[PDB]
Amino acid sequence: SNNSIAIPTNFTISVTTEILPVSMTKTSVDCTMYICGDSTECSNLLLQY
Amino acid sequence: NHNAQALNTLVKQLSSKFGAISSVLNDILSRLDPPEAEVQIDRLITGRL
């Protein structure tokens, strides 16, 4: 309306939660061991790539 | 630094055989017939792509 306002007469103190990721798992991969394991032939072939 | 490293890798891969007889296309073309040259060039092309 031209001349109508709404003013609060009380308050509520509300606590809310916000969850945010910060870090992830740190992983290391040994390329030779994953691809080839204990095979020497596989390592020699991998050296070409 | 990062950019430099990236570019350096992209150049070092040019010296990788990727299972081909050689990492130089001119050597392959001047030393094998077109049928087998096709196989070697295909391996090199796949690796470099």
Cα A1 to Cα A7, A9, B18, B44: the distances in Å are 14, 20, 78, 77
A48 touches chain B (CB under 8 A): yes
In sequence order, the 6+-apart residues with CB closer than 8 A to the CB of B13 are: B47, B48
Query: Could you give the count of Cα atoms lying within 13 Å of A49 in the half-sphere of its Cβ?
Result: 10
Residues of A in contact with B12 (CB under 8 A): none
What's the resolution in A?
2.8
Residues of B in contact with A46 (CB under 8 A): none
CB burial of residue B28 (10 Å; 0-12, 13-18, 19+): buried
In sequence order, the 6+-apart residues with CB closer than 8 A to the CB of A17 are: none
Method: cryo-EM
